[PDB]
Coordinates of C-alpha atoms in Angstrom, one line a residue:
Chain A
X1 CA -20.9 1.9 -0.8
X2 CA -23.8 -0.7 -0.4
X3 CA -23.3 -2.6 -3.4
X4 CA -26.6 -4.4 -4.7
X5 CA -26.9 -8.3 -4.7
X6 CA -27.0 -10.5 -7.4
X7 CA -29.3 -13.4 -8.7
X8 CA -27.9 -16.8 -8.2
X9 CA -26.8 -17.1 -11.9
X10 CA -25.2 -20.6 -11.1
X11 CA -27.5 -23.3 -11.7
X12 CA -26.4 -26.4 -12.6
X13 CA -27.1 -29.0 -9.5
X14 CA -29.1 -28.9 -6.1
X15 CA -29.4 -25.3 -4.8
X16 CA -27.9 -26.5 -1.4
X17 CA -25.0 -28.0 -3.2
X18 CA -24.6 -25.0 -5.3
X19 CA -24.4 -22.9 -2.1
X20 CA -22.0 -25.5 -0.5
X21 CA -19.8 -25.1 -3.9
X22 CA -19.9 -21.7 -3.8
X23 CA -18.8 -21.5 -0.1
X24 CA -16.0 -23.8 -0.8
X25 CA -14.7 -21.6 -3.7
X26 CA -14.8 -18.9 -1.2
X27 CA -12.8 -20.8 1.3
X28 CA -10.3 -21.8 -1.5
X29 CA -10.0 -18.1 -2.0
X30 CA -9.3 -17.8 1.8
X31 CA -11.7 -16.0 4.5
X32 CA -13.0 -16.7 7.9
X33 CA -16.3 -17.1 9.6
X34 CA -17.7 -13.7 10.2
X35 CA -21.2 -15.0 11.7
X36 CA -24.4 -16.1 9.7
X37 CA -27.2 -13.2 9.0
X38 CA -30.7 -13.5 7.5
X39 CA -32.8 -11.3 5.2
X40 CA -36.6 -11.2 6.1
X41 CA -39.6 -10.4 3.9
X42 CA -42.9 -9.4 4.8
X43 CA -45.6 -7.9 2.3
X44 CA -48.6 -5.8 3.1
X45 CA -50.9 -5.1 0.3
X46 CA -47.1 -3.0 -0.9
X47 CA -44.9 -2.6 2.2
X48 CA -42.2 -5.1 2.0
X49 CA -40.4 -5.7 5.4
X50 CA -36.7 -6.5 5.6
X51 CA -33.7 -7.3 8.1
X52 CA -30.1 -7.1 7.7
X53 CA -26.8 -5.7 9.5
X54 CA -27.9 -5.7 12.4
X55 CA -30.1 -4.2 15.7
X56 CA -32.6 -2.6 13.1
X57 CA -35.5 -3.8 11.0
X58 CA -37.0 -2.2 7.7
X59 CA -40.1 -2.1 5.9
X60 CA -41.1 0.0 3.0
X61 CA -43.3 -0.1 -0.1
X62 CA -41.4 2.8 -1.9
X63 CA -39.2 4.9 0.2
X64 CA -35.6 5.9 0.7
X65 CA -35.1 3.9 3.4
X66 CA -37.3 5.2 6.2
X67 CA -36.1 2.9 8.9
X68 CA -34.1 4.0 11.9
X69 CA -35.6 2.0 14.7
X70 CA -35.9 -1.6 15.8
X71 CA -38.5 -4.2 14.8
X72 CA -40.3 -3.5 18.2
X73 CA -40.9 0.4 16.8
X74 CA -42.5 -1.0 13.6
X75 CA -43.9 -4.5 14.8
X76 CA -46.1 -2.4 17.6
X77 CA -47.2 0.0 14.6
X78 CA -48.4 -3.2 12.7
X79 CA -49.9 -4.7 15.6
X80 CA -51.8 -1.4 16.3
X81 CA -53.2 -1.2 12.8
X82 CA -54.4 -5.1 12.9
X83 CA -57.3 -4.0 10.6
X84 CA -56.4 -0.5 9.5
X85 CA -53.1 -1.5 7.5
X86 CA -52.7 -5.2 8.2
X87 CA -52.8 -6.7 4.9
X88 CA -50.5 -9.6 5.6
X89 CA -50.8 -12.0 2.9
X90 CA -48.9 -15.4 2.6
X91 CA -45.5 -14.8 4.3
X92 CA -43.1 -13.9 1.7
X93 CA -40.0 -15.8 1.3
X94 CA -36.8 -14.9 3.7
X95 CA -33.2 -15.9 3.1
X96 CA -30.6 -16.6 5.3
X97 CA -26.8 -17.5 5.4
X98 CA -23.1 -17.4 6.8
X99 CA -20.9 -14.4 6.0
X100 CA -17.1 -14.6 5.1
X101 CA -14.6 -12.1 4.4
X102 CA -11.8 -12.5 2.0
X103 CA -9.9 -9.5 2.8
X104 CA -11.1 -6.3 3.8
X105 CA -14.4 -7.2 2.3
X106 CA -17.4 -9.1 3.0
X107 CA -19.4 -11.8 1.3
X108 CA -22.8 -13.5 1.9
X109 CA -24.9 -16.0 0.0
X110 CA -28.6 -16.6 0.5
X111 CA -30.7 -19.5 0.6
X112 CA -34.0 -20.6 -0.1
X113 CA -37.1 -20.4 2.3
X114 CA -39.9 -22.5 0.8
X115 CA -37.6 -24.9 -1.2
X116 CA -38.4 -23.4 -4.7
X117 CA -36.4 -20.1 -4.0
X118 CA -33.2 -18.4 -5.3
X119 CA -29.7 -18.8 -3.4
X120 CA -28.2 -15.4 -4.5
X121 CA -25.3 -13.7 -3.1
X122 CA -24.6 -10.3 -1.7
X123 CA -21.4 -8.2 -1.6
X124 CA -20.7 -4.5 -0.3
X125 CA -18.0 -1.9 -0.5
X126 CA -15.9 0.3 1.7
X127 CA -15.7 3.3 -0.7
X128 CA -18.3 6.3 -1.1
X129 CA -19.4 5.2 -8.1
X130 CA -16.3 2.8 -8.4
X131 CA -18.6 0.0 -9.6
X132 CA -15.9 -0.8 -12.1
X133 CA -13.2 -2.4 -9.7
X134 CA -15.9 -4.0 -7.3
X135 CA -17.1 -6.0 -10.3
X136 CA -13.4 -7.5 -10.7
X137 CA -13.9 -9.6 -7.3
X138 CA -16.9 -11.2 -8.6
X139 CA -15.1 -11.8 -11.7
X140 CA -12.7 -14.2 -9.7
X141 CA -15.9 -15.5 -8.0
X142 CA -18.1 -16.2 -10.9
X143 CA -18.6 -15.8 -14.7
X144 CA -20.8 -12.7 -16.3
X145 CA -23.4 -11.5 -13.7
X146 CA -23.9 -8.7 -11.3
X147 CA -25.8 -5.7 -13.6
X148 CA -25.9 -3.8 -10.3
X149 CA -28.2 -1.0 -11.3
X150 CA -27.7 1.3 -8.3
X151 CA -29.3 4.5 -7.4
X152 CA -26.7 6.2 -9.9
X153 CA -26.5 10.0 -10.5
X154 CA -27.5 10.8 -6.8
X155 CA -23.9 11.8 -5.3
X156 CA -29.8 11.1 -1.4
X157 CA -25.9 9.8 -1.9
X158 CA -23.8 7.1 -1.2
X159 CA -26.8 4.7 -1.0
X160 CA -26.9 4.3 3.1
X161 CA -28.6 1.0 3.8
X162 CA -30.8 1.9 0.4
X163 CA -29.3 -1.5 -1.0
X164 CA -32.4 -3.1 0.6
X165 CA -34.7 -1.8 -1.8
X166 CA -32.5 -3.4 -4.5
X167 CA -32.9 -6.5 -2.1
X168 CA -36.7 -6.0 -3.2
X169 CA -35.7 -6.8 -6.8
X170 CA -34.1 -9.9 -5.6
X171 CA -37.9 -10.5 -4.0
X172 CA -39.3 -9.6 -7.5
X173 CA -37.6 -12.8 -8.8
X174 CA -40.5 -15.2 -8.1
Chain B
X1 CA 5.7 -0.7 14.1
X2 CA 8.6 0.9 12.1
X3 CA 8.9 1.8 8.5
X4 CA 12.2 2.9 7.0
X5 CA 11.3 3.7 3.4
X6 CA 9.1 1.1 1.9
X7 CA 6.3 0.4 4.9
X8 CA 8.6 -2.6 6.1
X9 CA 6.6 -3.2 9.1
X10 CA 7.7 -6.1 11.6
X11 CA 6.6 -7.2 14.8
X12 CA 9.1 -8.0 17.8
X13 CA 10.0 -8.3 21.5
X14 CA 11.3 -6.4 24.4
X15 CA 14.8 -6.7 23.8
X16 CA 15.2 -7.8 20.3
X17 CA 15.9 -4.8 17.7
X18 CA 19.4 -5.8 16.1
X19 CA 17.7 -5.0 12.8
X20 CA 19.1 -1.5 13.7
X21 CA 22.8 -2.7 12.6
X22 CA 21.3 -3.8 9.4
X23 CA 19.9 -0.2 9.0
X24 CA 23.5 1.1 9.8
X25 CA 25.0 -1.2 7.1
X26 CA 22.5 0.1 4.6
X27 CA 23.0 3.5 5.6
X28 CA 26.8 3.3 5.3
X29 CA 26.0 1.8 1.6
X30 CA 24.1 4.5 1.0
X31 CA 26.5 7.3 2.2
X32 CA 29.1 5.2 -0.2
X33 CA 26.5 6.1 -3.1
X34 CA 26.0 9.7 -2.0
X35 CA 29.6 10.7 -1.8
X36 CA 30.0 9.0 -5.0
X37 CA 27.5 11.3 -6.7
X38 CA 29.4 14.0 -4.9
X39 CA 32.5 13.2 -6.6
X40 CA 32.8 10.6 -11.8
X41 CA 29.5 8.9 -10.7
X42 CA 29.3 5.0 -10.6
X43 CA 25.9 3.2 -11.1
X44 CA 23.3 2.2 -8.7
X45 CA 24.5 -1.6 -8.5
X46 CA 24.6 -1.1 -4.6
Chain C
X1 CA 9.3 -24.5 37.1
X2 CA 9.2 -21.0 38.6
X3 CA 7.6 -19.5 41.8
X4 CA 4.6 -18.2 40.3
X5 CA 3.7 -21.2 38.0
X6 CA 5.6 -23.5 35.6
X7 CA 7.6 -22.9 32.6
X8 CA 8.1 -24.9 29.5
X9 CA 10.0 -24.3 26.4
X10 CA 9.1 -25.1 22.9
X11 CA 12.4 -24.8 21.0
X12 CA 16.3 -25.0 21.8
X13 CA 17.7 -21.4 21.6
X14 CA 11.2 -16.6 25.9
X15 CA 7.9 -17.8 24.7
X16 CA 5.2 -20.1 25.5
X17 CA 4.2 -18.7 29.2
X18 CA 1.6 -20.9 31.4
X19 CA 0.3 -19.6 34.5
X20 CA -2.5 -20.8 37.0
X21 CA -5.9 -19.2 37.9
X22 CA -5.5 -18.7 41.7
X23 CA -9.2 -18.6 42.1
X24 CA -10.7 -21.3 39.9
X25 CA -9.7 -23.8 37.5
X26 CA -8.7 -23.7 33.6
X27 CA -5.3 -22.3 34.4
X28 CA -4.6 -20.0 31.4
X29 CA -1.4 -19.2 29.2
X30 CA -0.3 -16.8 26.7
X31 CA 2.5 -17.4 23.9
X32 CA 3.9 -13.8 22.8
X33 CA 2.8 -14.0 19.4
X34 CA -0.3 -14.6 17.2
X35 CA -3.0 -16.8 16.5
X36 CA -5.8 -15.3 19.0
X37 CA -9.2 -17.4 19.9
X38 CA -7.5 -20.6 18.9
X39 CA -5.0 -21.1 22.0
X40 CA -8.6 -20.9 23.9
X41 CA -9.3 -24.7 22.6
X42 CA -5.9 -25.6 23.8
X43 CA -6.8 -23.9 27.3
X44 CA -10.1 -25.9 27.3
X45 CA -8.5 -29.3 26.3
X46 CA -6.1 -28.9 28.9
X47 CA -8.8 -27.8 31.6
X48 CA -11.0 -30.7 30.5
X49 CA -8.5 -33.7 29.7
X50 CA -5.1 -32.5 31.0
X51 CA -3.6 -35.7 29.3
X52 CA -3.5 -34.5 25.7
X53 CA -0.5 -31.9 25.7
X54 CA 2.0 -33.1 23.0
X55 CA -0.4 -32.6 19.8
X56 CA -0.5 -28.9 20.9
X57 CA 3.3 -29.1 21.5
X58 CA 3.8 -30.2 18.1
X59 CA 1.4 -27.4 16.7
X60 CA 3.0 -24.8 18.7
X61 CA 6.3 -26.2 17.4
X62 CA 5.1 -26.0 13.7
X63 CA 3.7 -22.3 14.2
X64 CA 6.6 -20.9 16.3
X65 CA 9.2 -22.2 13.7
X66 CA 6.9 -20.6 10.6
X67 CA 6.8 -17.4 12.9
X68 CA 10.5 -17.1 13.4
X69 CA 11.1 -18.0 9.6
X70 CA 8.5 -15.3 8.4
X71 CA 9.9 -12.7 11.3
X72 CA 13.4 -13.2 9.8
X73 CA 12.6 -13.1 6.2
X74 CA 10.1 -9.9 6.6
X75 CA 13.3 -7.9 6.0
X76 CA 13.7 -8.3 2.4
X77 CA 10.7 -7.7 -0.1
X78 CA 8.6 -10.9 0.2
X79 CA 5.3 -12.2 0.8
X80 CA 3.8 -15.4 2.8
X81 CA 1.1 -17.6 2.2
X82 CA -0.1 -21.1 3.4
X83 CA -0.2 -23.2 0.2
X84 CA 0.7 -23.1 -3.5
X85 CA -3.4 -23.1 -4.2
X86 CA -2.6 -24.9 -7.3
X87 CA -1.6 -28.6 -7.3
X88 CA -1.6 -28.7 -11.0
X89 CA 1.5 -31.5 -11.6
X90 CA 1.3 -33.2 -8.2
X91 CA 4.6 -35.1 -9.1
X92 CA 7.4 -32.7 -8.4
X93 CA 6.4 -31.5 -4.8
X94 CA 6.1 -34.0 -1.9
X95 CA 6.2 -33.6 2.0
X96 CA 3.6 -32.3 4.8
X97 CA 2.3 -29.2 6.4
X98 CA 4.7 -26.8 5.0
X99 CA 5.1 -22.9 4.4
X100 CA 5.8 -20.9 1.2
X101 CA 7.4 -17.3 0.6
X102 CA 7.6 -15.4 -2.6
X103 CA 9.0 -11.9 -4.1
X104 CA 8.0 -9.0 -6.3
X105 CA 11.6 -7.4 -6.9
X106 CA 12.8 -9.9 -9.2
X107 CA 9.5 -10.3 -10.9
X108 CA 5.7 -10.8 -10.4
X109 CA 5.3 -14.5 -9.6
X110 CA 8.1 -16.4 -11.9
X111 CA 9.0 -19.1 -9.0
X112 CA 7.5 -19.3 -5.6
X113 CA 9.5 -20.8 -2.7
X114 CA 7.9 -23.7 -0.8
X115 CA 10.0 -24.7 2.3
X116 CA 9.4 -27.1 5.3
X117 CA 11.5 -28.1 8.1
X118 CA 12.3 -31.8 8.4
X119 CA 9.5 -32.5 11.3
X120 CA 9.8 -35.4 13.7
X121 CA 13.6 -35.2 14.2
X122 CA 15.2 -38.6 15.6
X123 CA 15.1 -38.4 19.1
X124 CA 14.9 -34.6 19.4
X125 CA 11.9 -32.5 20.3
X126 CA 13.4 -29.4 18.8
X127 CA 15.8 -29.0 15.9
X128 CA 13.9 -30.1 12.7
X129 CA 17.1 -29.4 10.3
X130 CA 14.9 -26.9 8.5
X131 CA 14.8 -28.7 5.2
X132 CA 15.1 -26.7 1.9
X133 CA 14.0 -27.0 -1.7
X134 CA 13.3 -24.9 -4.6
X135 CA 10.7 -24.9 -7.4
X136 CA 10.6 -23.4 -10.7
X137 CA 6.9 -23.8 -11.9
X138 CA 5.1 -20.6 -13.1
Chain D
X1 CA -6.1 29.1 -25.0
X2 CA -2.4 27.8 -25.3
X3 CA -3.1 26.1 -28.3
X4 CA -1.6 28.8 -30.4
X5 CA 2.1 27.0 -29.6
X6 CA 0.5 24.2 -31.7
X7 CA 0.9 26.6 -34.6
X8 CA 4.8 27.0 -34.1
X9 CA 5.1 23.2 -34.7
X10 CA 3.0 23.8 -38.0
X11 CA 5.8 26.2 -38.9
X12 CA 8.5 23.7 -38.7
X13 CA 5.8 21.4 -40.9
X14 CA 5.7 23.7 -43.7
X15 CA 9.2 24.1 -43.4
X16 CA 9.7 20.4 -44.2
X17 CA 7.1 21.3 -47.1
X18 CA 9.9 23.1 -48.8
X19 CA 12.7 21.0 -47.7
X20 CA 11.2 17.8 -48.7
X21 CA 10.8 18.9 -52.6
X22 CA 14.4 19.8 -52.5
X23 CA 15.3 16.5 -51.2
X24 CA 13.2 15.2 -54.0
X25 CA 15.3 17.0 -56.8
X26 CA 18.6 16.7 -54.9
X27 CA 17.9 12.7 -55.2
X28 CA 17.2 13.5 -58.9
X29 CA 20.5 15.4 -59.3
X30 CA 22.6 12.2 -59.7
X31 CA 21.7 8.7 -60.8
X32 CA 22.9 5.2 -59.7
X33 CA 26.6 5.4 -58.4
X34 CA 26.9 1.8 -58.1
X35 CA 23.9 -0.2 -56.7
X36 CA 25.7 -3.8 -57.3
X37 CA 23.3 -5.1 -54.7
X38 CA 19.6 -4.1 -55.6
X39 CA 17.4 -1.7 -57.6
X40 CA 15.8 -0.1 -54.3
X41 CA 17.8 2.8 -55.1
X42 CA 15.1 4.1 -57.5
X43 CA 12.6 3.0 -54.7
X44 CA 14.7 5.3 -52.5
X45 CA 13.7 8.0 -54.9
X46 CA 9.8 7.3 -54.1
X47 CA 11.0 7.0 -50.6
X48 CA 11.4 10.7 -50.6
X49 CA 8.3 11.1 -52.5
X50 CA 6.6 9.3 -49.7
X51 CA 7.6 12.2 -47.4
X52 CA 5.6 14.4 -49.5
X53 CA 2.6 12.8 -47.9
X54 CA 3.6 14.7 -44.8
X55 CA 2.5 17.9 -46.4
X56 CA -1.1 16.6 -46.5
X57 CA -0.6 15.8 -43.1
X58 CA -0.2 19.6 -42.6
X59 CA -3.5 20.2 -43.9
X60 CA -4.8 17.5 -41.5
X61 CA -3.1 19.2 -38.4
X62 CA -5.6 22.2 -39.1
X63 CA -8.4 19.8 -38.0
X64 CA -7.4 19.8 -34.2
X65 CA -6.2 23.4 -34.5
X66 CA -8.7 26.5 -34.3
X67 CA -10.2 26.0 -30.9
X68 CA -11.6 29.5 -30.5
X69 CA -10.8 33.2 -30.4
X70 CA -10.3 35.5 -27.8
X71 CA -12.2 38.8 -27.6
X72 CA -10.3 42.3 -27.7
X73 CA -8.4 41.5 -30.8
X74 CA -4.7 42.7 -30.8
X75 CA -4.6 41.8 -27.1
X76 CA -4.1 45.1 -25.9
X77 CA -0.3 45.0 -27.5
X78 CA -0.4 47.8 -30.0
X79 CA -2.3 50.3 -27.6
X80 CA 1.3 51.8 -27.2
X81 CA 1.3 52.5 -30.6
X82 CA -1.6 54.6 -30.6
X83 CA 0.1 57.4 -28.7
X84 CA 1.6 60.4 -30.5
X85 CA 5.1 60.8 -31.9
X86 CA 6.1 61.8 -28.6
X87 CA 5.8 58.1 -27.5
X88 CA 7.8 56.9 -30.6
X89 CA 11.5 57.8 -30.1
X90 CA 9.1 52.2 -26.6
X91 CA 9.7 48.7 -28.4
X92 CA 12.3 48.1 -25.7
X93 CA 9.9 47.0 -23.2
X94 CA 8.3 44.2 -25.4
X95 CA 12.1 43.2 -25.8
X96 CA 12.3 42.9 -22.1
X97 CA 8.8 41.3 -22.1
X98 CA 10.9 38.3 -23.9
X99 CA 13.9 38.7 -21.9
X100 CA 12.1 38.5 -18.7
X101 CA 10.4 35.3 -20.1
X102 CA 13.9 33.9 -21.4
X103 CA 15.1 34.8 -17.6
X104 CA 12.5 32.4 -16.1
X105 CA 13.1 29.9 -19.1
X106 CA 16.9 30.1 -18.3
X107 CA 15.9 29.4 -14.5
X108 CA 13.5 26.7 -15.7
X109 CA 16.5 24.9 -16.9
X110 CA 19.0 26.3 -14.1
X111 CA 16.9 25.5 -10.9
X112 CA 16.3 22.0 -12.6
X113 CA 20.1 21.5 -13.0
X114 CA 20.3 22.8 -9.4
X115 CA 18.7 19.6 -8.3
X116 CA 22.2 18.0 -8.6
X117 CA 23.5 19.9 -5.6
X118 CA 27.1 20.0 -4.3
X119 CA 26.8 21.0 -1.0
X120 CA 29.7 18.7 0.8
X121 CA 28.7 20.0 4.2
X122 CA 25.6 21.9 5.8
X123 CA 26.4 22.6 9.3
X124 CA 29.5 24.0 10.9
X125 CA 29.0 27.5 8.7
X126 CA 26.5 29.3 11.0
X127 CA 19.6 28.7 12.9
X128 CA 16.1 28.5 14.9
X129 CA 15.1 26.0 11.8
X130 CA 11.7 26.0 13.9
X131 CA 9.4 28.8 12.8
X132 CA 9.0 31.4 15.7
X133 CA 5.7 33.4 14.6
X134 CA 2.6 31.4 15.0
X135 CA 1.4 33.1 11.9
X136 CA 3.4 31.3 9.2
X137 CA 1.1 28.2 9.9
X138 CA -1.9 30.3 8.9
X139 CA 0.1 31.4 5.7
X140 CA 0.7 27.9 4.8
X141 CA -2.9 27.1 5.7
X142 CA -4.3 29.8 3.1
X143 CA -1.6 28.8 0.5
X144 CA -2.9 25.2 0.8
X145 CA -6.4 26.5 0.5
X146 CA -5.5 28.3 -2.5
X147 CA -5.6 24.9 -4.2
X148 CA -9.2 24.1 -5.6
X149 CA -11.8 21.5 -4.8
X150 CA -9.5 20.5 -1.9
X151 CA -10.7 22.2 1.6
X152 CA -8.5 21.9 4.5
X153 CA -9.2 23.1 8.0
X154 CA -7.3 23.6 11.4
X155 CA -8.4 24.1 14.9
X156 CA -4.9 23.4 17.1
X157 CA -6.7 22.5 20.2
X158 CA -3.4 21.1 21.8
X159 CA -1.4 23.9 22.1
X160 CA 1.8 25.4 20.4
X161 CA 2.1 22.5 17.8
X162 CA -0.1 22.3 14.6
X163 CA -3.1 20.2 14.1
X164 CA -5.2 20.2 11.0
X165 CA -7.7 17.9 9.2
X166 CA -8.0 17.7 5.3
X167 CA -11.1 16.3 3.1
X168 CA -11.3 15.0 -0.3
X169 CA -14.0 13.9 -2.7
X170 CA -14.4 10.8 -0.9
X171 CA -14.7 10.4 3.0
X172 CA -11.2 9.6 3.3
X173 CA -10.2 12.7 5.4
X174 CA -6.5 12.9 6.8
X175 CA -5.4 14.3 10.2
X176 CA -2.0 15.8 10.4
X177 CA -0.5 16.7 13.8
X178 CA 2.8 18.1 13.6
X179 CA 5.1 20.6 14.9
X180 CA 5.5 24.4 14.1
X181 CA 6.9 24.3 10.6
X182 CA 7.1 20.5 8.9
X183 CA 4.5 17.9 8.7
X184 CA 4.9 14.8 10.8
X185 CA 2.9 12.0 12.5
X186 CA -0.4 12.1 10.6
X187 CA -3.0 9.4 10.3
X188 CA -5.9 8.9 7.8
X189 CA -9.4 7.2 8.0
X190 CA -12.7 6.9 6.1
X191 CA -16.4 7.4 6.4
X192 CA -16.6 9.0 9.9
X193 CA -14.5 6.4 11.4
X194 CA -12.5 9.4 12.8
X195 CA -14.9 11.9 12.8
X196 CA -12.5 14.3 14.1
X197 CA -14.7 17.4 14.5
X198 CA -16.3 16.4 17.6
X199 CA -15.2 12.8 18.1
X200 CA -16.4 12.0 21.7
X201 CA -15.8 15.5 22.7
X202 CA -13.0 17.0 20.6
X203 CA -10.8 16.4 17.7
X204 CA -9.9 12.9 18.8
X205 CA -6.8 10.7 17.9
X206 CA -8.2 7.1 18.0
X207 CA -5.4 5.7 16.0
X208 CA -7.5 3.4 13.9
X209 CA -9.4 2.3 10.7
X210 CA -10.6 -1.2 9.7
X211 CA -7.6 -2.5 7.9
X212 CA -7.9 -0.5 4.7
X213 CA -6.3 2.9 5.1
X214 CA -3.3 2.0 7.4
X215 CA -1.0 1.2 4.5
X216 CA -1.8 4.8 3.1
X217 CA -1.0 6.2 6.4
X218 CA 2.2 4.3 6.8
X219 CA 3.2 5.4 3.3
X220 CA 2.1 9.2 4.3
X221 CA 4.4 8.9 7.2
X222 CA 7.1 7.5 5.1
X223 CA 6.8 10.4 2.4
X224 CA 6.7 12.9 5.2
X225 CA 10.0 11.6 6.8
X226 CA 11.5 11.4 3.4
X227 CA 10.6 14.9 2.0
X228 CA 11.9 16.8 5.2
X229 CA 14.1 19.3 3.0
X230 CA 16.6 21.3 5.0
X231 CA 15.2 24.6 4.3
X232 CA 11.9 25.8 2.6
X233 CA 8.9 24.4 4.9
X234 CA 6.5 25.7 2.4
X235 CA 7.9 23.8 -0.5
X236 CA 8.0 20.6 1.9
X237 CA 4.3 21.1 2.6
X238 CA 3.3 21.9 -0.8
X239 CA 5.0 18.7 -2.0
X240 CA 3.0 16.7 0.4
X241 CA -0.3 18.2 -0.4
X242 CA 0.5 17.7 -4.2
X243 CA 1.5 13.9 -3.0
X244 CA -2.1 13.7 -1.3
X245 CA -3.9 15.1 -4.4
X246 CA -2.9 11.9 -6.2
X247 CA -5.5 9.8 -4.2
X248 CA -8.4 11.9 -5.5
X249 CA -9.4 9.1 -7.8
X250 CA -8.4 5.5 -6.9
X251 CA -9.4 4.1 -10.3
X252 CA -6.6 2.5 -12.0
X253 CA -4.8 -0.4 -11.7
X254 CA -1.7 -0.8 -13.7
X255 CA 1.0 -3.2 -13.7
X256 CA -1.2 -5.9 -12.0
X257 CA -5.0 -6.8 -11.9
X258 CA -7.4 -5.1 -9.5
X259 CA -7.5 -8.1 -7.1
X260 CA -4.0 -8.3 -5.6
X261 CA -5.0 -6.8 -2.4
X262 CA -7.6 -4.6 -0.4
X263 CA -6.3 -1.8 -2.5
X264 CA -3.1 -0.2 -4.2
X265 CA -0.9 2.8 -3.8
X266 CA 2.5 4.2 -3.3
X267 CA 3.2 6.8 -5.8
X268 CA 6.3 8.8 -4.3
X269 CA 7.4 9.0 -8.3
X270 CA 4.6 11.3 -9.1
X271 CA 2.3 8.3 -10.3
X272 CA 0.2 5.5 -8.6
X273 CA 0.1 1.8 -9.6
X274 CA -0.3 -1.4 -7.9
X275 CA 1.1 -1.4 -4.4
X276 CA 3.2 -4.4 -2.4
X277 CA 5.6 -4.2 -5.6
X278 CA 8.2 -1.5 -4.9

């Protein structure tokens, strides 16, 4: 279902220009503006915050997606433990970007936050496995990439909103 | 929306459905095919 | 015109009805068909300027011509598109904003079929004479 | 298992093992009648010799053979022989054992050739095609549930007509609301988009999906409108179930690449492939 994101393998020019070329290729494929989203990140010495689609925020050091409430429910907990668990170091980079839809799918590319950051892309699926066919789409998008590495052998099944943990892997690339 | 055999969905208006006549012609042809299969059966070049 | 509001044709045969908001400005309109959330821009333009009508007229002409084409060709096995998506040898085809249809029953994609009506008919807001051209690229 | 039938082919194999060598010596029974074109005739001899290699292949044929042996040797067949002389005048039954099989096998051809029917008419020769008893529905439900790994359920909250839902490996459940006997007017969705257990308040219709299964729903409607045989509604619903079973994988993509559209499926020919091409 929720396919994992991928690092921006394409790196031959300006990151902004690279994202622009990727979006131009996507438009050449043929899509429509489905809005713009973001992916936040806040580390606390290591609970890593997150936000995606979208009326719900998430934060987890190592858990199977314990988030089912809005940021307010979580931000209040953080503010309450201002000296107990508040270990907010230098603000972790957070990406953003528009999202388009070729056909019956969704695409989303990321952006840099401080400037020397990545601009990776993320895609998902609509089935419940089936990692083979979804790769073909990316074959039409770029060259060899997207190793995936999902939580295989679980279907704790279908990885519902657990892909944010995979998003943490993208945060590891720094 | 309508599907005869192959998911041929088309949109239309209040009083424009003359495709029915085309369906009648195709049904006539298919009936010729069927009766040929009944009684020497020619190929399926219809 | 009519009793509730006015009426304007787009072709020379039904479509493109426009009425007025009896409680405010920005008189609405609705052409039976497709392309939603796009006519709203036309609505805004008429509400603001009320002068620029003929560009939307030509646009609606193109749109409904292509719509009629597709609605009549959608009985045989085919598929529609908006461009050939490959201008390899930009020498054979030439023209303007056009349409294109393809087919499966003969083969996957041996030869597409790009077609365009002869827009801007002489002294005729309609009847673009529907020019036809065949191509044999692969 | 049923691999024993393979040994039958092996029989024919060793048959050639005889014929081959005969075909050898027969070829040596006479010389060149009139070549006049080439000396491949002698090579022709070696040609027959080549077929002798087939014999070695027979020995290879045993590699795939010998899967496993079944318990209780003799398979309860000669138990009748253990009877006294009184039982021996009984082989007749065994003969019928084959005969009955032949019967079925005969029908296996006959019914097959019955496919080409000759019913020039089907009316003006008589009734109540709609099944009166509200128990044959449960019978068909049980027959369908006899199929493994494919669960079927039904509640029928609307009334006399039949209403049912089916689930598969994925969450692409199918809701079929049809008349008393034959299946018609069904729909499909995926991932709780229908949730026809207690949708809103009950097994709702909602006539919707996110533009992925709609084509599959239309194709299933077409299949229902096409498989409506004049009689034997059980056969009709069984064919419908078999057709539905063909989507349990959604993995392959022949006669095209897996990028033509959202998905690909139209198997009325007992085999799925790239859609929008038939």
